[PDB]
Amino acid sequence: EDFCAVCINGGELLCCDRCPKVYHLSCHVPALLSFPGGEWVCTLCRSLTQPEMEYDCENARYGPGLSMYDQKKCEKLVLSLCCNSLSLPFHEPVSPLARHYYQIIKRPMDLSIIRRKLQKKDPAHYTTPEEVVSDVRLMFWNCAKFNYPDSEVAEAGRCLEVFFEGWLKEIYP
Measure the CA–CA gap between 34 and 123, rounded to whole angstroms. Answer: 24
Closest-CB residue for Zn ion?
4
CB of 16 to Zn ion, least distance (A): 3
CB of 49 to Zn ion, least distance (A): 17
Given the complex with Zn ion, which of 14 and 113 has the nearer CB atom?
14
- No. of helices (H) and no. of strands (E), the chain: 6, 2
Given the complex with Zn ion, which of 44 and 153 has the nearer CB atom?
44
- How long is the chain? 173
On whether the CB atoms of residues 110 and 160 are closer than 8 A, the answer is no
CB of 168 to Zn ion, least distance (A): 20
Given the complex with Zn ion, which of 24 and 117 has the nearer CB atom?
24
Given the complex with Zn ion, which of 44 and 154 has the nearer CB atom?
44
Angle of helix 68-83 versus helix 152-171 axis, rounded to 10: 150
Instruction: Report the interface residues with Zn ion, using CB under 5 A.
Output: 4, 6-7, 16, 18-19, 24, 27, 42, 44-45
Given the complex with Zn ion, which of 3 and 102 has the nearer CB atom?
3
Measure the CA–CA gap between 164 and 7, rounded to whole angstroms. Answer: 19
Question: DSSP string of 14-61?
Answer: EEPSSSS-EE-TTTSSSPPSS--SS----TTTS-SSS-S----SHHHH
On whether the CB atoms of residues 90 and 66 are closer than 8 A, the answer is no
